[PDB]
Each structure stands twice: as structure tokens, then as C-alpha cells.
Enzyme design. Structure first.
Site, PDB file in Angstrom:
ATOM      1  N   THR A 117       0.828  -1.197   0.000  1.00  0.00           N
ATOM      2  CA  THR A 117       0.000   0.000   0.000  1.00  0.00           C
ATOM      3  C   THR A 117       0.866   1.252   0.000  1.00  0.00           C
ATOM      4  OG1 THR A 117      -0.162   0.332   2.389  1.00  0.00           O
ATOM      5  CG2 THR A 117      -1.559  -1.362   1.401  1.00  0.00           C
ATOM      6  N   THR A 118       0.450   2.248  -0.777  1.00  0.00           N
ATOM      7  CA  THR A 118       1.191   3.498  -0.835  1.00  0.00           C
ATOM      8  C   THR A 118       1.094   4.244   0.492  1.00  0.00           C
ATOM      9  OG1 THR A 118       1.139   5.722  -1.786  1.00  0.00           O
ATOM     10  CG2 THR A 118      -0.837   4.365  -2.025  1.00  0.00           C
TER      11      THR A 118
END
Ligand SMILES: Nc1ncnc2c1ncn2[C@@H]1O[C@H](COP(=O)(O)OP(=O)(O)OP(=O)(O)O)[C@@H](O)[C@H]1O
Ligand SMILES: [Mg+2]
Lengths: 125, 85, 243, 233, 134, 243, 109, 145
Positions: free
Chosen positions: F31-32
Site C-alpha cells: 500500500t502506498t
């Protein structure tokens, strides 16, 4: 965690000769050509300092060292290995003789004692 | 690899060319390498080209010294790793 | 079998392949540095390459001050450099505590080289991936530059080069040292040796430097510090106006 | 089949995954269905036990570690003993040192921290066991889904096991339904029993196949088995 | 009732470079010439080496033949009713591209028989023989 | 010889460790998560991906807190970062126990980097597969460091890892250029929300959920806490306004 | 790959001065950026200093590839001329791909 | 040029003749796939169509921009994710010659035959320009020197 390499790295080849020993001999036979000869009133040990780069100082590097004020050491193999060997040999010579007997060990026993370290290195895994 | 052979061939090549009087090949041959009979002529060609680049029409010692550093550096092998010896 | 090249074991040619491959890891950052030895002080200058604009220039540096008197410049991947810096600082601490006097540069270099040798000899360990240049001034000996390697071969240098163009800078300085026959720069002031090193580095790499491309470390008598950006700009301005 | 990069747990695939952990998760999938769910004030576990033959028994797929917590099984039985023992050690330590009943999220964090140290160092193997921690603290009813990878997340309900994940759709369609049900344990348990029934493929639910646990404020953690579960069949 | 072209794995290893690729290409063309054909690539352990690098370019010709086969099985052109049977004793050393569905769909698991399997084997292999009754 | 990637401490012929590279490639499949270094403090941000709606909203969190002033946001192998932040918390606790001063950010960076590299020296330990954007506020000011699995950390003015890592850094550069003199935390949180929204466009197929947190002296006076109430909604609909 | 060359062919005398073309270095890369981004419709104060810093180890044609990718990115927004912040995206994108290539190693002969 | 058997007079010129393998590898029937049969690839499809198809139908935009269109696009990936099916869809949608080429087909028998074949492939592509060559399984000849 520790050391997982508890197995010996020197294994008898089927030909009946140690690998790593015959490999270190090859690594020794190439390198600096040193020599030493024994005379009646003394012993002279000589080696040549191959200045790797001409900007370096061969004075800082000690090709020959003082094991004891009576016994000196000259090598022809790998630099750092010889340095570690000479430090360990000085330490164990001190421990074995200066602490227990009070003087400097003779050449015959010191050589066997220092070779103890190397003959353990080819054995300890 | 013999010093005498390199001296002889260096002098032979230099005689035809325009070495300056204040230029010493003995200073060039102080170190004993595995120099071939061909590289020790292309080195002098490179020195001549270097002198021509600086507009000098007679090669000097300062260009012979630099020529050794550009035509013969290493054979690599293990000399790049000093701890082997 | 073929497991020779994987661990630090001898080879049919009598070579330690892993240690050989370790040297090729020191040129990943392709950062060129050099250190000259002045009459009374030492100065080491290294390229300061900031890849991204998101970097803070202040924190990115390959120059670590080991103690108040000993400075060190390290070439290679930074994390291993920081490991070496931590160990070197801790060992300087231990020696100062145990013996009571500040240690000379050669002792520290020899101890780090011995540590690297222990790394090479033990199979379960891997050799350090960095090349460390120890720089300091020794009142007992004089100004000194010491450069170790992943294998553990350390030796004092009149002037040290590194990076991808180590050979070229080496010849560039060797011509000067062989024409001047002196083992050190005759410039008494630490001001002059900085410009000497910067001029030779510029002529060697063929590049022109700004305030941020190069970081200079100076080791005077019983003092080591890193010059700020304004200092490097002032030095470059002086060089430009002088020549 | 196994590939070159299988080896030990301390090894990265070129794609960037751990094959050991993936195998642990597959063994998690192969186990039986143990769908569980929670409400605002209640947490319900439903387990489908498996028998080797007719003249056999059923595994206790519902393990209690405290009066305010419970466990469910979706994989390797023996490692569940180790995991439950560790959870009980920490719960008793909390009781004896803090007096505070172990928070469900804290229990999940401890479980993931434990599951890591086999996959992080040589000589260990991932825990091929899937825990559905339930419990009720001062905050409220909680439910977790432990995985051998160390992933722990809190969900209203889930189902880990063979074709159990096919029964997640029943929860999803009724997710808005069982959330607003408070203080109604029997009907929530009935909804859970409907959820597991969607994961049946060969044999239906019987007295000896349904193991049900439930926890809450008025209802402490209780395990239902035998004739005590036939009312919800 | 269809043609049953048989291929031993070692036969696809010629001497001159690139000849295995021609071998496989001509084989597949012959198979496509017929209405319905079954190919029995056998001991594909021979030409089955997973793609790998060692600096010396080890046995890269066998790899070339293997990729030619993979392209022929499923490339820029459909196969054309060329149902193919593979057989091996060490499926571990097969390149994952071959194991990929599209060129291999079902993976049978011929394994050691159980007690009932052993009894059936004995009955089949002892249908002949003057066995004593009882 | 082959198998240079089977083990960890083995050096490749070009000198690049291979397990670390595979760990890096495993990091990007995460996930960013971005972080902005505002003038007074730091502003973290995460994009925890909402799976099937069974997952409870606003409960699962990924911004872990160390002590009071250090925050940790991690991407990649989430449990590995859990363990890394656990060790970091233990180190901070030990430092505060035996120095009674809150751990400064660069010191925490040194500790975490030394721990991380300790796992890429041996053959009996898998390198960490987590990249962290840990940062916070200390006495000297604010710092924001990204840690990489190779053990290299840098003092970034903003960083991001995840699927939308490349997109996030472009908007980070745009924000830095737009405000060279600096940035306030209040606008920094809205900019972080906008950056995360731009990065999430790559993962528009799956649903998103945004959690943000910031440590500052102007408002939080050196305390780390999440964003709750109308501020988070204001950031969300401001960032959705330009869309 | 000069290493895989027959030494008889490599002898000084057959092959004379061995001019070596290295990777562009700092000031060299600025010339590449100016040359390859002069035909493109520049629409800003194109100070390539940031691109020069980030394009570390870039080799010639790669810089042209950054120009091409910046042109592509300008097209993605239908703009008819590249913007100074679109060169940055292209440089980053090319630099990420540069990791795919092997770490180029070579020895000065 | 055609030439008489005995007088050796130049009877008539002929079009350039390539290797007979090169004529066969040109696609003739367009494989019916379309972009509607490939799913899960949106970024990849947009990147490829805007790098191999767009600078073939509206190259005037690129010429106005004064920019060099990219030569070709690599399509690396794990086995069985659409690296070949996307090429089939591209050949379906495109309106130019789509010479297919398996890399092992290039490797040939005698010294230089493969080089001659791969030179004639590009010569034919230049003849019927524009084109999209599809060297497939590139690792067959693209191994490191
Ligand atoms: N996104 C997708 N949509 C539809 N079908 C797909 C998709 N990805 C893969 N496929 C399926 O994959 C098969 C073809 O795989 P493909 O040839 O592209 O794989 P590959 O790994 O590139 O092969 P090779 O390396 O041998 O060329 C077809 O049956 C096709 O239906
Ligand atoms: Mg394909």
C-alpha cells in the site's frame, strides 16, 4: 542464530589429499618471495616489500615483525592473515610463558604453539 | 622482460624519431613489466602524438612519462588486489 | 563442487573469490574522493552527489567524524559504511576508556582491518562492502592518511584516491609528487591545501564544482571538522579568481 | 510442484514472495470451515468438525484461552496447542501483573509477533494454524483473523477453511443485518449456522458436527457441543 | 484411432546449433498436416531444463529447442487439435513456462499403488501362469 | 556459477547482493504511504486498502507510534515492519531509561538502520521486506527519513513507497517547488491527502481508505496523534474538489 | 564488450589509440539535455539542473528517452508542448527502468 | 533482374526477393481477438497503444512536437499473464503489416544464415511500411554475451 557453520570446511578428497591445505599451498607459492638462512653466529631473514602503489608508504607496513625480542617472523602469503596470525601468536606466547614461566619461550616451543592455531583452523568448522 | 632488450629496442625506435636531448628512456624503463616488442613502439607513437597535440615538434620527457601511463596500465589479473601478496 | 565462489574459500588459482567480488561493490556510488597530506594538517575532499531534489543535502554525506581528532571518509554503499562508522566509534570509545589517551590513526586502521580479516576468515560472515580512508593528525607521528579495504590490507598513503577514476587521480597526483620529491605538501596553512586538492581534483575529473557537488573534511592539529557549504563556495571563488 | 526457491523459510522469490508462507496459507485453505462473526455486543463462532471414519471422533476446533476470549482452528492441530498456550501465558500475565483483561487487538499483535520469529530466522517454520480470536473488552465485542503470514485484521465476520470462503458471501449479503442485532444471541447463532450451511458440499449439519461458542457481557465464553447444540441445528 | 507420433526426449538433441528447433517445427508441421494427431513427448526431462544463467552459457542449445517447442505449443497461432502427452520421472526440473496451463492442462499423479492396487496388479500380471488354486 | 541468489551474504559478480534486491521488489507490492516534512513537524499518510466490506472501517491502523514524537508508517510486508517498529520501540525505551532524554530522530535512524543491516550480513536470516517513512520532531527541529531494506536511510524532505510510489514522488516534487520557502502543517495535511488520492488512481479498481497523522510543535507540541473529526473530512473533500 | 576481443586484434599496432567513450558526467549530461530538448516545444525556463542531478549513470540515448517520455506525458493531458514538470516525471520513469538493466561494468583497457 | 538463358540479355527486372521464410511469417488473416477479449490490463493496454499504435496513425502530432517516436516496447512479465494475447489484439486492431517472429526461428543452421534472415525481415518491414515486428520469446537469442 550464532554460527551455523559448525561443519568442517576441509574434507578429504577421494585422492587422499586435503583440499584446502593443497589450495593454501598454491596460494602461498605465489606472492612475495621471502627467504631466511642460518649462520653460525646468527640468523638473517629477508623479504622484499612490493610497493603496490608508489604513493603508499612501505614504512607503515611491517613485512617482518617481532614475536619476541629474540624471535622474529617473516611471511610470504596474504598480508592480513599474517597480521592476525602474528597478533594471536604474540598473545598466546605471552599467555603461555610470560604469565607462567616468567621469560620468553624458545623458538622450538613457540613454533609448535603458533602452528597449533593453524592446525586448529584447518580442523575447526 | 629483460632490461637490456627493452633498452636496445627503445633506443632503436628513438634513433629514427626526434627524441629531445633532455629525454631519458632509462627513466622510462626503470620498472620491469611484461612489455611486448610492439607495445613499446606504440607507446612512442602515442608520445609523439601527445607532443604534436601540444604543438611541440620534438617530444620531451614529460610526454614520454605520460605515454607509459596510457599504453600500459595493468594486465588486471590479481595486481588490483594487493592483499593476495 | 561449484560452491567455492559462494563463500570465502580458496580457488584453483589460489584466490578468494568473495573478497574479490566485494571490491566491485565499493564502486556502486561512483563517488570520487581524494585526500592530501599538508605540512601540519590533512584535508580530504569527496564528491557529494545528491540524486534527488527530495534529499536534504545536509544529512547526505560520506564523511564521518570518528572522534574529536580522527576523521574518516568511506567509499561504497552507505549502510555498510554506517555499520563501519558505528563499530569504529565504539572501538575508539573502548580504547580511550581502557588506555586513557586518544588513539592514533594507525591503531584504529589496524583494528578495523583485523575486524575485516575476521569477517573474511569466518565463513558465516560476509566481508564489509566499503573502503575506509582514515585521516588524522598524530602529534606522536605527524599528519597521516590511512586506507583499509574489505580484505584488511591497510597501509599509510602520501595521498589517497578512490572511486571509478582512482587510477587517473593517482597518476595526476603522482606526477606532482615525483616532480617535487617531497612526501607532503609544503603549504603550512590548511587554507592552501584545500585549494591545491580542489584544483587537482578538478583537473583530474575534468569537471567544475559548485557549492553542493563536493564535501571537504579538514583535520588540523587536534581538531577535525567538516566545512559548510559557504566555506566551499568561498574556496571555489578564491580558486576561480586566483587562476 | 516445489521449485528451487522453496528451500528454507529465509529465502525470497524473484517475484518477491515467501513460498513457505504461501504453503502455510494453502494448508490453512485445506482445513475445515470455521466461519465466525460478531455483533456490537456478542461474538459467535461456528465450527464444522471432521471425523476420519464412522468409528471416530471430532477435533475440538474451539479452544478457550480465557473467560473473555476464545479460539478457532483452521489448520494444523498440534501448532494450535503452542499458539493457545502462548495466548494463555500472556492472558495470565496480564491478569497477574496488570489486572487488565487482554485487549483483543493486543492479543492479535502478540500472536503476529510470535508467528514472525519462525519466518524471520533459520530453523523455524510458519504456524500453519488459523485463529479466529473472539472476545469482549470494555471497548466492545471484537473478532480477528490470524494468518501464518503474521497478517492480523479485525472483521465483522469471516470463514477460513475448505470452500469456507465461499460462505463469505452469505455474511456480506447480511452484513448490514446482523450488525444491528444486540442482546439476541440465539438468532445471531442461527444466522451463523445459516452461514456455514452455505459451505456444505457433501453432508449436512448434525449434533456431532456443529461446535458453537459465544461470548458477551451477560454471556461469558461458553462452548456448545453434543445435545446442547441441536436446538440451533 | 488417431496418429500417435512418438518423441523421445533425447532425439530432440542434435549436434549442430538450432537443429532441435527445426526438429520440433517440422514435427509440429507434420502433426498439423493430419486431421487428428496425438504427440507423446516423452522423457522431456532431456529438453526440459529451466532457463538459467551461469556465465558460460551452459547447454543453451537445449534451452533454444525448449523455447521453440513452447512457442509452437502456444504462440501467435493456435495449435489445431494437436493434443499432446508429456511423461517424466523428475517433473521438478521442468521450466514453469511448460507447467503453465495452455500447453499443459491436467497433471496426472501416477503414484505408488495401495493394497487394492497391488492386488489388481497381481491379478492382471497373473492372469496367465499355472498358479496353484487357493 | 549459478545460485548466487539462493543465499543472502553471497556477492554477485557485479558486486550487488541479490536477496536485498528481491526484498526491494517485494516492497513495491504494498500500500502506498507518503510523508511530508512541513516547517514545524512531519505529516504522515497511509492508503490502507479496503478489502471485502467485512473489514471494519476506521479500526485497522498502520501508523504505529514510537515513544511520543517518533511515528512509523510502513509498506510491504506489514508484519516485518511490525517487528521492526517493535525493536525500535524497545531501543527508544532503553535510551530513555538510561539517558532520560527522548531519543533524537537521527539516533533512532542509526539504531533502526543498524538493526536492518544486521539481517543482511548472515546466511541464516531473511532481509526485511519493509520500507518505512518514519519521522518526527525533536529538540533540534523536524526530520523525515525513509528506510530501505538494504539498510540505507536518508533525510528526505518527503518520500513515498507503494504501488503509486512513482506518481507520489512527482507530486511531492511539485509541492516542494510550489512552496520553496516552506510549508505549514495545516496545508501539509491537505496536500498529503491530495497526493495519496493521485497515487490511488492506479488502484482505482479496489476501494480506498485514508488515514493520516502528524507530529508538530505548533499544535501537537511534540506529541503524535492521528487526524480525527472535521479536519480529516475537510482534507478529503478538498482533495476530491480538484477531481 | 572489449573483453571478448581476440588479443591479436587488440595489440597496439593493429588497433592504435583506444578511444574510450564513457558514461556522460554532469556537465556532459547538460549538453545532452540541451541538444535533445531543443527541437521540442519548450514552454518554460528549462533549468535541467534537477534532471542532471537525478539522471545519474544515464547513457546518452536514455536522455533522449526522457525527452520522448516527457513528450508522451504532455500528450496525455492533450497539451501541445512539454512542461518543465513533465520532464521530471519522464526522468523519474526512465531512472526506475534503469534498474532493470544490469549494472554496467567495464574495464579501461 | 530476369535474364535470358543463352543470350544473357536482361529480359525484365524483378521485385526484391527475400528469404522464403520471411514471406511466410507475415500475418495474412487478422486474428479476431479485439481489446474486448483481454481483461485486467488497462495501464498496459494504454501504454502499448500509445507507444506502438498512436505513432502510426497520428504521427503528425509527434512531428509537430518535433520528437522521436519510440522504436519498440518490451513486454516482460511472468508466464501466462497476456504478453502474447495483447499482441494478438494489437494485430487485430492495427492496420499495418504485423510480421510475427519466434526468436528460435531466427537461429539457423549455417554461419550467417540467421543474420541474413533477420536482415531480410527488417528489409521486408521497410518495404511494406509501416510495420510491427513481434520478435517473441526474445530470451532465445537475447542471452548475455
Ligand atoms: N488478461 C487476460 N485476459 C484474457 N485472457 C488472458 C489474459 N491473460 C492471459 N490470458 C490467457 O492466456 C492465454 C495465453 O497466454 P500468453 O500466450 O499471453 O502467455 P505468455 O506467458 O505471454 O506466453 P509465452 O511466454 O509462451 O509467449 C490465453 O488462453 C488467454 O486467454
Ligand atoms: Mg505468450
Amino acid at each position: 542464530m550464532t554460527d551455523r557453520y559448525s561443519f568442517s570446511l576441509t574434507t578429504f578428497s577421494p585422492s587422499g589429499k586435503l583440499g584446502q591445505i593443497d589450495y593454501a599451498l598454491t596460494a602461498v607459492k605465489q606472492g612475495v618471495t621471502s627467504l631466511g638462512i642460518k649462520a653460525t653466529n646468527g640468523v638473517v631473514i629477508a623479504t622484499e616489500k612490493k610497493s603496490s602503489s608508489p604513493l603508499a608508504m612501505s614504512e607503515t607496513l611491517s613485512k617482518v615483525s617481532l614475536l619476541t625480542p629474540d624471535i622474529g617472523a617473516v611471511y610470504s602469503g596474504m598480508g592480513p592473515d599474517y597480521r592476525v596470525l602474528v597478533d594471536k601468536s604474540r598473545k598466546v606466547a605471552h599467555t603461555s610463558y610470560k604469565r607462567i614461566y616468567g621469560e620468553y619461550p624458545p623458538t622450538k616451543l613457540l613454533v609448535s604453539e603458533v602452528a597449533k592455531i593453524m592446525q586448529e583452523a584447518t580442523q575447526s568448522g | 622482460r629483460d632490461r637490456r632488450e627493452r633498452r636496445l629496442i627503445f633506443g632503436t625506435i628513438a634513433s629514427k624519431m626526434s627524441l629531445a636531448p633532455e629525454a631519458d628512456l632509462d627513466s622510462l624503463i626503470i620498472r620491469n613489466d611484461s612489455l611486448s616488442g610492439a607495445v613499446i613502439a606504440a607507446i612512442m607513437q602515442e608520445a609523439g602524438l601527445r607532443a604534436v597535440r601540444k604543438n611541440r615538434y620534438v617530444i620531451l620527457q614529460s610526454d614520454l612519462e605520460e605515454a607509459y601511463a596510457t599504453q600500459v596500465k595493468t594486465d588486471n589479473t590479481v595486481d588490483k588486489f594487493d592483499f593476495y601478496k | 563442487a561449484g560452491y567455492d565462489r559462494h563463500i570465502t574459500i580458496f580457488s584453483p588459482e589460489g584466490r578468494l573469490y568473495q573478497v574479490e567480488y566485494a571490491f566491485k561493490a565499493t564502486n556502486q556510488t561512483n563517488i570520487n574522493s581524494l585526500a592530501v597530506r599538508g605540512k601540519d594538517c590533512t584535508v580530504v575532499i569527496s564528491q557529494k552527489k545528491v540524486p534527488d531534489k527530495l534529499l536534504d543535502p545536509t544529512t547526505v554525506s560520506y564523511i564521518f567524524c570518528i572522534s574529536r581528532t580522527i576523521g574518516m571518509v568511506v567509499n561504497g554503499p552507505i549502510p555498510d559504511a554506517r555499520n563501519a562508522a558505528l563499530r569504529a566509534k565504539a572501538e575508539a570509545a573502548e580504547f580511550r576508556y581502557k588506555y586513557g589517551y586518544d588513539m592514533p590513526c594507525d591503531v584504529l586502521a589496524k583494528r578495523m582491518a583485523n575486524l575485516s580479516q575476521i569477517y573474511t576468515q569466518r565463513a558465516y560472515m560476509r566481508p564489509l562492502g566499503v573502503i575506509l580512508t582514515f585521516v588524522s593528525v598524530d602529534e606522536e607521528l605527524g599528519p597521516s592518511i590511512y586506507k583499509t579495504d574489505p580484505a584488511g590490507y591497510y597501509v599509510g598513503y602520501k595521498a589517497t584516491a578512490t572511486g571509478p577514476k582512482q587510477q587517473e587521480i593517482t597518476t595526476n597526483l603522482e606526477n606532482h609528487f615525483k616532480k617535487s620529491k617531497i612526501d607532503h605538501i609544503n603549504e603550512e596553512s590548511w587554507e592552501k591545501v584545500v585549494e591545491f586538492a580542489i584544483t587537482h581534483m578538478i583537473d583530474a575529473l575534468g569537471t567544475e564544482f559548485s557549492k553542493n557537488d563536493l564535501e571537504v573534511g579538514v583535520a588540523t592539529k587536534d581538531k577535525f571538522f567538516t566545512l559548510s557549504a559557504e566555506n566551499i563556495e568561498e574556496r571555489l571563488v578564491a580558486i576561480a579568481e586566483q587562476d | 510442484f516445489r521449485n528451487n526457491y522453496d528451500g528454507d523459510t529465509v529465502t525470497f522469490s524473484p517475484t518477491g514472495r515467501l513460498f513457505q508462507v504461501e504453503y502455510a496459507l494453502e494448508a490453512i485453505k485445506q482445513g475445515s470451515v470455521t466461519v465466525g462473526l460478531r455483533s456490537n455486543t456478542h461474538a459467535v463462532l461456528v465450527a464444522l468438525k471432521r471425523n476420519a471414519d464412522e468409528l471416530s471422533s471430532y477435533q475440538k476446533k474451539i479452544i478457550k484461552c480465557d473467560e473473555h476470549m476464545g479460539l478457532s482452528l483452521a489448520g494444523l492441530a498440534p501448532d494450535a496447542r503452542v499458539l493457545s498456550n502462548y495466548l494463555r501465558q500472556q492472558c495470565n500475565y496480564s491478569s497477574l501483573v496488570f489486572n487488565r483483561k487482554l485487549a483483543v487487538e493486543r492479543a492479535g499483535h502478540l500472536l503476529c509477533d510470535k508467528a514472525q520469529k519462525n519466518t524471520q530466522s533459520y530453523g523455524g517454520r510458519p504456524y500453519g494454524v488459523g485463529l479466529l480470536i473472539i472476545g469482549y473488552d470494555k471497548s466492545g465485542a471484537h473478532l480477528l483473523e490470524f494468518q501464518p503470514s503474521g497478517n492480523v485484521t479485525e472483521l465483522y465476520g469471516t470463514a477460513i477453511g475448505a470452500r469456507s470462503q465461499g460462505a463469505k458471501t452469505y455474511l456480506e449479503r447480511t452484513l448490514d443485518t446482523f450488525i444491528k442485532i444486540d442482546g439476541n444471541p440465539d438468532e445471531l447463532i442461527k444466522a451463523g449456522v445459516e452461514a456455514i450451511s452455505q459451505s456444505l458440499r457433501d453432508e449436512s449439519l448434525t449434533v456431532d458436527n456443529l461446535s458453537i461458542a459465544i461470548v458477551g457481557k451477560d454471556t461469558p465464553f461458553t462452548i456448545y457441543d453434543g445435545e446442547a447444540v441441536a436446538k440451533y441445528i | 484411432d488417431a496418429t500417435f507420433i512418438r518423441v523421445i526426449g533425447s532425439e530432440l538433441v542434435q549436434k549442430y546449433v538450432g537443429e532441435g528447433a527445426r526438429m520440433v517445427r517440422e514435427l509440429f508441421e507434420m502433426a498439423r498436416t493430419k486431421k487428428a494427431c496425438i504427440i507423446f513427448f516423452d522423457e522431456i526431462d532431456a529438453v526440459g531444463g529451466a532457463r538459467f544463467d551461469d556465465g558460460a552459457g551452459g547447454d543453451n542449445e537445449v534451452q533454444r529447442t525448449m523455447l521453440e517447442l513452447i512457442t509452437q505449443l502456444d504462440g501467435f497461432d493456435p495449435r489445431g487439435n494437436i493434443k499432446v502427452m508429456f511423461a517424466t520421472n523428475r517433473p521438478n526440473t521442468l521450466d514453469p513456462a511448460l507447467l503453465r496451463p495452455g500447453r499443459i492442462d491436467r497433471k496426472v499423479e501416477f503414484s505408488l499403488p495401495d493394497l487394492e492396487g497391488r492386488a489388481n496388479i497381481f491379478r492382471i500380471h497373473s492372469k496367465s501362469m499355472s498358479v496353484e488354486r487357493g | 556459477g549459478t545460485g548466487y541468489d539462493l543465499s543472502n551474504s553471497v556477492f554477485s559478480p557485479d558486486g550487488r547482493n541479490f536477496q536485498v534486491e528481491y526484498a526491494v521488489k517485494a516492497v513495491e507490492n504494498g500500500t502506498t504511504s507518503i510523508g511530508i516534512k512541513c516547517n514545524d513537524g512531519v505529516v504522515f499518510a497511509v492508503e490502507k486498502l479496503i478489502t471485502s466490506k467485512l473489514l471494519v472501517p476506521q479500526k485497522n491502523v498502520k501508523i504505529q507510534v514510537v515513544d511520543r514524537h517518533i511515528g512509523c508508517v510502513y509498506s510491504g510486508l506489514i508484519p516485518d515492519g511490525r517487528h521492526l517498529v517493535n525493536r525500535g520501540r524497545e531501543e527508544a525505551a532503553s535510551f530513555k531509561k538510561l539517558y532520560k532524554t527522548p531519543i533524537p530522530i537521527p539516533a533512532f535512524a542509526d539504531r533502526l538502520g543498524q538493526y536492518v543491516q544486521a539481517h543482511t550480513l548472515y546466511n541464516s536470516v531473511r532481509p526485511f521486506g519493509v520500507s518505512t517513512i518514519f519521522g518526527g520532531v525533536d529538540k533540534n527541529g523536524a526530520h523525515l527519513y525513509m528506510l530501505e531494506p538494504s539498510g540505507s536511510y536518508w533525510g528526505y524532505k518527503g518520500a513515498a513507497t507503494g504501488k503509486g510510489r512513482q506518481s507520489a514522488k512527482a507530486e511531492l516534487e511539485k509541492l516542494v517547488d510550489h512552496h520553496p520557502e516552506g510549508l505549514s502543517a495545516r496545508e501539509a495535511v491537505k496536500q498529503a491527502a491530495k497526493i495519496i488520492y493521485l497515487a490511488h488512481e492506479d488502484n482505482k479498481e479496489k476501494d480506498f481508505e485514508l488515514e493520516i497523522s502528524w507530529c508538530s510543535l505548533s499544535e501537537t507540541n511534540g506529541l503524535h496523534k492521528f487526524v480525527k473529526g472535521d479536519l480529516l473530512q475537510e482534507a478529503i473533500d478538498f482533495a476530491q474538489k480538484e477531481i | 564488450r572489449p573483453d571478448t576481443l581476440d588479443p591479436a586484434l587488440l595489440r597496439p599496432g593493429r588497433l592504435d589509440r583506444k578511444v574510450e567513450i564513457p558514461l556522460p558526467n554532469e556537465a556532459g549530461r547538460l549538453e545532452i539535455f540541451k541538444i535533445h530538448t531543443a527541437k521540442v516545444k519548450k514552454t518554460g525556463e528549462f533549468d535541467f539542473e534537477a534532471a542532471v542531478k537525478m539522471s545519474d549513470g544515464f547513457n546518452g540515448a536514455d536522455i533522449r528517452n526522457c525527452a520522448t517520455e516527457a513528450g508522451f506525458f504532455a500528450i496525455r493531458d492533450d497539451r501541445d508542448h512539454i512542461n518543465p514538470d513533465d520532464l521530471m516525471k519522464a526522468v523519474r520513469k526512465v531512472a526506475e527502468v534503469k534498474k532493470l538493466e544490469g549494472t554496467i561494468e567495464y574495464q579501461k583497457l | 533482374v530476369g535474364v535470358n538463358k543463352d543470350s544473357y540479355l536482361i529480359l525484365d527486372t524483378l521485385p526484391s526477393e527475400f528469404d522464403s521464410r520471411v514471406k511466410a511469417m507475415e500475418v495474412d488473416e487478422k486474428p479476431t481477438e479485439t481489446y474486448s477479449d483481454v481483461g485486467g490490463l488497462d495501464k498496459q493496454i494504454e501504454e502499448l497503444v500509445e507507444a506502438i499504435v498512436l505513432p502510426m496513425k497520428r504521427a503528425d502530432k509527434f512531428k509537430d512536437m518535433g520528437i522521436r517516436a519510440p522504436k519498440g516496447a518490451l513486454m516482460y512479465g511472468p508466464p501466462g499473464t497476456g504478453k502474447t494475447l495483447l499482441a494478438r489484439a494489437c494485430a487485430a486492431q492495427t492496420n499495418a503489416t504485423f510480421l510475427k517472429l519466434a526468436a528460435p526461428q531466427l537461429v539457423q543452421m549455417y554461419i550467417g544464415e540467421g543474420a541474413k534472415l533477420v536482415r531480410d525481415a527488417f528489409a521486408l518491414a521497410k518495404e511494406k511500411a509501416p510495420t510491427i515486428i513481434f520478435i517473441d520469446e526474445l530470451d532465445a537469442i537475447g542471452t548475455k554475451r
